[PDB]
């Protein structure tokens, strides 16, 4: 029993972290096979960060200008290319520690672990979610760029995020491993607004199921609702509209606990209309939305 915001073990990803220095800029790289993936803003000085012409800036760079370091050994760059907002540095050595991996682009609401790194060295690991406005709420200082977000399925690491930016709002923006930013964000030092951040309804519901499984039942009530009645309430509180797909994905949790999904929706509706009244759910005083139904099933069943 017990319910915690848990991250995947980070070992497979630690063995891929390298340091990439270009000019005077140092950030993190991801070494998989003979390729180091890193943000393309590594070629930028602070002046050209206001409005960079990456294609023009890259012309002035050669293989020897990209310094890649794995722990203490220098990797030899034999090729370089730009793929959207990531630079791909071909090195002469395949990473001996390369895990089985995939590059996946995730949907908002989905969760992933982040291995925060500085100078190619990992400092910590935390669990977070791709917000519906395509930002993440992480912990990223200067030098953390190139830190990756990922998931694990037994032995295969599914890389989904690469950190590139902090918006003036303190939230984080980044790309998938093909260099495509999540959301409308661009790798430029310009005023970019994050957009309305809504709450991931399917995740709050899953977390309510995890709470019931782990003992917290005070929020359970004698009421039920409909998808349309609940969604009227969801809209009012800036919650994601709940669809039949969401109800389907909550099926295993609904079945395990014996609580129908629309009954849990009525509990959530009352929590939204009345607040917690000074109480907590799984040690939290607010409705947690960074646990997908898959996270709850996995944590309550011990999938290794």
Ligand X SMILES: *CC(=O)c1c(C)c(C(=O)c2ccc(F)cc2)n2ccccc12
Stretch that binds a copy of itself, among 32-40, 169-177, 195-203, 242-250 (CB under 8 A): 169-177
The 3 state secondary structure assigned to 256-285 is HHCCCHHHHHHHHHHHHHHCCCCCCECCEC
Stretch that binds a copy of itself, among 50-58, 77-85, 101-109, 293-301 (CB under 8 A): 293-301
Report the partner that residue 214 touches, choosing among ligand X, a copy of itself, none (CB closer than 5 to 8 A by kind). Answer: a copy of itself
Q: How far is residue 10's CA from residue 1's CA, in Å, rounded to a whole number?
A: 23
Is residue 10 involved in binding a copy of itself (CB under 8 A)? Answer: yes
* Cβ(202)–Cβ(246) below 8 Å: yes
Is residue 71 involved in binding a copy of itself (CB under 8 A)? Answer: no
Are β-strands 77-83 and 86-91 bridged in parallel, bridged antiparallel, or unpaired?
antiparallel
Stretch that binds a copy of itself, among 35-43, 116-124, 201-209, 237-245 (CB under 8 A): 116-124
Report the partner that residue 41 touches, choosing among ligand X, a copy of itself, none (CB closer than 5 to 8 A by kind). Answer: ligand X
Q: How far is residue 81's CA from residue 83's CA, in Å, rounded to a whole number?
A: 7
Is residue 141 involved in binding a copy of itself (CB under 8 A)? Answer: yes
Q: Whole-number minimum distance, CB 167 to a copy of itself, in Å? A: 10
CB-nearest residue to ligand X: 145
> Active-site residue 41, yes or no?
yes
* Buried b or exposed e, range 106-126, using 16+ CB within 10 angstroms: bebbbbbbbbbbbebebeebe
Is residue 27 involved in binding ligand X (CB under 6 A)? Answer: yes
Is residue 143 involved in binding ligand X (CB under 6 A)? Answer: yes
Is residue 49 involved in binding ligand X (CB under 6 A)? Answer: yes
Closer to a copy of itself by Cβ: residue 4 or 100: 4
Q: Tell which one of 52, 109, 138, 149 touches a copy of itself (CB under 8 A).
A: 138
* Cβ(56)–Cβ(179) below 8 Å: no
Chain Cα centroid distance, residue 140: 12
Active-site residue, selected from the candidate residues 16, 22, 41, 80: 41
Residue/partner pairs of 9-14 with CB below 8 Å, 24 or more apart: 9/152, 10/113, 10/115, 10/122, 10/125, 12/99, 12/152, 12/157, 13/99, 13/115, 13/122, 13/148, 13/150, 13/157, 14/115, 14/122
176-293-16-106 Cα dihedral, nearest 10 degrees: -10
Is residue 57 involved in binding ligand X (CB under 6 A)? Answer: no
Report the partner that residue 10 touches, choosing among ligand X, a copy of itself, none (CB closer than 5 to 8 A by kind). Answer: a copy of itself
Q: Tell which one of 83, 98, 110, 119 touches a copy of itself (CB under 8 A).
A: 119
Residues with a known catalytic role: 41, 145
Instruction: Point out which residues bind ligand X (CB under 6 A).
Output: 25, 27, 41, 49, 142-145, 165-166, 187-189
């Amino acid at each position: 029993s017990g319910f915690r915001k848990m991250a995947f073990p980070s070992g497979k990803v630690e063995g891929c972290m390298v340091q990439v220095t270009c000019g005077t800029t140092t950030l993190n790289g991801l070494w998989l096979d003979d390729v180091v993936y890193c943000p393309r803003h590594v070629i930028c000085t602070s002046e050209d960060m206001l409005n960079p012409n990456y294609e023009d800036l890259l012309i002035r760079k050669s293989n020897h200008n990209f310094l890649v370091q794995a722990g203490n050994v220098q990797l030899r760059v034999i090729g370089h290319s730009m793929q959207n907002c990531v630079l791909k540095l071909k090195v002469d050595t395949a990473n001996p520690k390369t895990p089985k991996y995939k590059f996946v682009r995730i949907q908002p609401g989905q969760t992933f672990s982040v291995l925060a790194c500085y100078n190619g060295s990992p400092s910590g690991v935390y669990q977070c979610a791709m917000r519906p406005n395509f930002t993440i709420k992480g912990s990223f200082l200067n030098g953390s760029c190139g830190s990756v977000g990922f998931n694990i399925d037994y032995d295969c690491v599914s890389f989904c995020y690469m950190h590139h930016m902090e918006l003036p709002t303190g939230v984080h923006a980044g790309t998938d491993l093909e260099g495509n930013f999540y959301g409308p964000f661009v790798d430029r030092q310009t005023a970019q607004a994050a957009g309305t951040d809504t709450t991931i309804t399917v995740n709050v519901l899953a977390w309510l199921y995890a709470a019931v499984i782990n003992g917290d039942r005070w929020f359970l009530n004698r009421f039920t609702t409909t998808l349309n009645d609940f969604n009227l309430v969801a809209m009012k509180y800036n919650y994601e509209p709940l669809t039949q797909d969401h109800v389907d994905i909550l099926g295993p949790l609904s079945a395990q606990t014996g609580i129908a999904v629309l009954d849990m929706c009525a509990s959530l509706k009352e929590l939204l209309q009345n607040g917690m009244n000074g109480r907590t759910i799984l040690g939290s005083a607010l409705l947690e939305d960074e646990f997908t139904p898959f996270d709850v099933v996995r944590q309550c069943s011990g999938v290794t």
